[model samples]
Target: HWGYGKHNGPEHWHKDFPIAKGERQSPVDIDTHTAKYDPSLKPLSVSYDQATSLRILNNGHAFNVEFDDSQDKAVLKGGPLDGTYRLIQFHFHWGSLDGQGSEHTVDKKKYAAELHLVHWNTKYGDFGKAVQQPDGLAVLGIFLKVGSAKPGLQKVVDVLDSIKTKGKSADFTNFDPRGLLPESLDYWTYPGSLTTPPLLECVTWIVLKEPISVSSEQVLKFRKLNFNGEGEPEELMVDNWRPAQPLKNRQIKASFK
Candidate 1:
């Protein structure tokens, strides 16, 4: 029912169905030109133990590492964001062509890809139920760009070979998604919604201003993964990105205060 072909694509859906308008979207332009509004924004004191115990799952669209109630890392300590938050899942949005692969745009410019680390406040019990609440989730967005050479993305790209077939995911044991975070923790925080369908508006988005690089060849390999089915010939899955949406009076704050 959902796909990349005409009428199935996001642009087509946004045009055909008006309801898609209400979907809380992300990767909007981080207006650096604006003055800093909230100085209270600070990095959450995350622990390594929490990062190590994460459960990695290849959720069809992208590989995600999740942390539930069973995991000790699910709890948050001191910071502006102090609550028992369960790491839900992490995924990415990219473009078909290397020229433009990212989902969130800034001042009309798109990056290579966007990585999302989703988490939910355990105060509401579990992610499934908490996601419906107003302050239930927090998502970290990391930007990716294609460089002349592969910049260690193979750690993740290598796994694609095992889950190349549609709807197929391997255990991917002993992997930590935090390793994928950019060297710099400096990020931009904003109140937004999920970038994908059922775009829940309860998410607090933290996007890293710095972007990590990957090789063009590596990106091509990502496109080779089957996006449709086995019967259909293997087609390049480039342009898996969503266009940017309006801000609608939303304020985007940063950690650089």
Candidate 2:
């Protein structure tokens, strides 16, 4: 399986998934100077109904908060997108240690971690079908900086103990995703693919400028997770983030100055 280990790591991913060498690969470096500021870019508008929140899954890669997108109970619109996108799930990426971890960098500086909110274009019937198109997926990226414990984040941390091992999950709902986001919606956007295997290029990345704070202790819980399932050898689930890719010819649009 693909992982962040030396043998099955990001460098070796291209051998198995050819799309790893795709033109619009994700988690790219965000050069603030070169990023174009677009006045036409709309302020992001997110509507997430806590009642539509489903379960949380420990996919071994990251802990994800799944949502009920069957009827657009949670939706993200406006921000460089042409249509409304239904929220499906949200996850994180981090390092096993400090000083390095985030998938996307700002001015070539790495953050402690990253948060990704995955949504699919409502133009298509479902997420599976939309992910095959050019504009199928829309992911909102929020960078994480180590600081004090966040009350909104504590709710998520409280459930990590129940999902410490791989494939373990718990009944997770009644949580509002809006509280998880930072105050500023100012962001940079561009065409990119998923950071994992199959590396679909349907994602329109909206990366926020302001990073949300996560306590150092809260981050340790992520490392406690296991990549392997029950009865398998223990492998710490850290440094699971993919390295930044080339910018190629794509232009990043900024929502604010």
Candidate 3:
């Protein structure tokens, strides 16, 4: 029932969800100059099977390409993660305005967009179950810069026409999320929670230092997406990012020194 509207905006979230002000909440501003650099971080090991990609759907909040995590068909290891993390789904966060969208900022600079790859620890076996535990989730955060159109994102963009409305989904397969990654695995690690509701603090954040490319034309197409169901007034699905939270009792660790 929550949305990025005047009646239910970010400032109003804490009334319904008390943990909106929790210590380890997500979308923190990454102060590059102050972040401690560590040499102990390992190179990220991500291997995603094309077959594990089940479908792409409009979850109303954003668009997520879901994966079949019934088995460990695709997994992520190394780079701040404790054990193998099975890929569950991947989604994006963009705002209504051009200058404000991305969840995390680098040195107070907010990019055009942000992408989140949601995964759960294999130890818990289920995403639903793992979210409740302390060390259950691991998310990869990739910032999207506006420039040339990324060929890697064409497939995902092509399917948006069919799934223009909320809850609309289509079979999306044979796509590897690795193609969307930046060249460097260098990253910042910290403890955080889901940017959305229930806000479980189970994530080991692996935010890549580099960002991927997206064209201005593509960003406009992303704005055309809807949040309401079919036949409902087209509620624009943008400006969905939550405001940055505090860094209390949290230290940002970098994979590079």
Candidate 4:
């Protein structure tokens, strides 16, 4: 199975999922100087209904806050996106050490963690079909840095205790994820793939420039999670991020000057 261990990690992913070595892979090193500011890029639009947040589940890899996407309750528009993309789920990837954890870095600078808001393009009808298209998914990547505690983050972390082991889940409703975002919407946009396997090259990555703050203790709480089920050998779920892939003829467009 696919995981963050040395045997099943990113380096060996290409053996099973050939697309892992595809042209438009994700989580690239975003050199600020090379990212051209596009005047035509519109500001991002994010609208989430609190009631749409269904539950949080730890699925052996990382814990994800699942959403009810049957309707247009929570969706992302604009900012390098052609049409509306419905939010499916949201998850966090962090490091064991405080110095490095983020998937996409800025000029080789890594943040403590990264948040992924996965959305599916409505034009594709469903998530299954969307993954096969070039512009079927749009993911919002928000960097998490160590600083003052974020109350919004605490709400999510509080529930982690219940889902400490893989396959565990808890009901988590009426949570508005928009509160997790930073004040600035400035971002770098690029065509990329899922940082995890199947590694489909269908994602339009919108990585925010401004990072939100979370206390160092809060990040440590994430490391307490186990990658194995209660009956299996325990393995902490840390460093679940893919290293920056080669840019390879791709252009990273910015929404700000």
Candidate 5:
């Protein structure tokens, strides 16, 4: 089972896991002034068929969905970005509750949660192999807020009943995540690294400025998932999110009209 105690939080993650120190971290303060603002960087639309067939993987900390590239659109053709990239997996980071669950902070204010859609370039073959390459991945970050409840995410919440046992797997199919995206495609783009271990510097992050709203109850239910497993009765996965990291010499760019 996983271990958690004093100095076991995000601040000390790099210490316990030596490789964490070298990994490219995220949720850093977005400095708008220094940000390279661009309006044309947008994600290509995908059909419902391409959205489905997402392989769900439960990696203890969170639930991830791997995308099938064969069904994706060819919108990235020769546009600075390599079209060889394929959607790999998507996951989320939240707090103990909806009041404070987001991984990123702006002016010391935290949102409800952060969802990341991850992708890897085919040049690296597959996700497992792509993790080692510097230019192998891309991630889209969407912030969640606690406001008016919406039925859009009910499908995801329903599956919580099955995977709530921690380290458990539940069959989740026929779910469309594109509807979860905010109406606005406006986003902030940057060249950053992964927020977890093996933090390679090969990620191109697209952080959406618009925040999606979910019910407080939904947030609480999500926090109930255990980080350990049913066997371990003591350890609970109350909070599995990492704190915001330093931006170093990097600049945060945005796409705003």
Candidate 6:
């Protein structure tokens, strides 16, 4: 069972998942100085007409809101993507403290947390198939800062008590992920991986430059969820994020200056 512990952490991930050390890995440090401004990039287009959220689960690693990806009701297009990608699920990564948490860094600076809206390329017809292709997945990364309360995130925090243990889940419906997005859509795009294990290098990461706000109190609620399941010894799920991977020969393209 891989976890954030000393033995099964990111440093040890490469043993089992060899791709963990592969080229074009994810969550790289977005060094603004090195990122090239790509004027040819198009504005990202996200449309969620009828987003039907099913449930929220503890998942041991992170809590995720599962959405119905059967149809293209919610899709992400434009930007670095070449085709429409369906929204599969959305999740977050955070540290126990407010100082650091995000997987990807900006100029070596970490955020309080990071949100990942996972989507799969529709051209593959199935997410399973897409994961094997280079353009299979498209994830939107939104940095979160500690500040004013976000009503949008509050809705998620309010349900944390119900799912305090791993594998615990409850019905989470009528939730629009768009409410959590920032006003600006400026982003940095690059070739990356899933960040987590089975670390597939199929994601087209579109990380938003602007961060959204969330109260520190709300962040505390995330700590309530345990990494260990009911029978296992309890472990805090904080710091579930992976450290920045090497950029290698990859080039990060910025949509804005």
Residue 130 lDDT (model 5): 72
In Å, residue 113's CA in model 6 sits off its true spot by: 0.5
RMSD of each: 2.9, 1.0, 1.2, 0.9, 3.0, 0.8
Q: Which pairs clash inside model 4?
A: none
Model 6: residues with Cα > 4 Å off, grouped in runs: none
- lDDT against the true structure, per candidate, is 0.66, 0.89, 0.87, 0.94, 0.65, 0.93
lDDT of 3 by residue, 202-243 (tens): 888888899999888788888889988999998888998987
1-257: candidate 1 lDDT, tens digit per residue? 54555667776655544535764566477777672546676566555355543444444455554544446564443334657566666667777787787877665678877787677787877788877887788776788888854444566677777766666665554556656667787777767776655566777777777887777877777777766545767755667666777777777766775
Off by more than 4 A, model 1 = 12-19, 35-37, 52-60, 65-69, 74-82, 148-152
lDDT of 6 by residue, 1-257 (tens): 78888999999999999999999898999999999999999999999777889999999999999999999989999998898999999999999899999999999999999999999999999889999998899999999999998888888999988888899999999999988999999999999999999899999999999999999899999877899888898788899999999999899999998
Worst 10 residues of 1 by lDDT: 52-61
**Model 2 agreement with the true structure over 1-257: per-residue lDDT tens digits:** 88788899999989999989999999899999999899999899888754377788889888899888889788889989999899999999999776778999999999999999999999998999998999999999999989877678878888988887789988897888887889888999999999998788899999999999889998888778888887899998899899999989899888878
Model 1, residue pairs in steric clash? 27-104, 95-101, 95-239, 96-238, 96-239
Off by over 4 Å in 3: 49-51
Candidate 6: count of backbone clashes, pairs at least 3 residues apart or interchain: 0
Better of 3 and 6 by TM-score: 6
Pairs of colliding residues, candidate 2 = none
Q: Report the alpha-carbon TM-score of model 3 versus the true structure.
A: 0.96
Model 5 lDDT at residue 192 = 72
Backbone clashes, each candidate: 5, 0, 2, 0, 4, 0
Better of 2 and 6 by TM-score: 6
Q: Model 5: per-residue lDDT, tens digit, 125-242? A: 7677777776777677788899876576777777776775555775566666676677776677666777765456677777777888888887777776776667777445555666
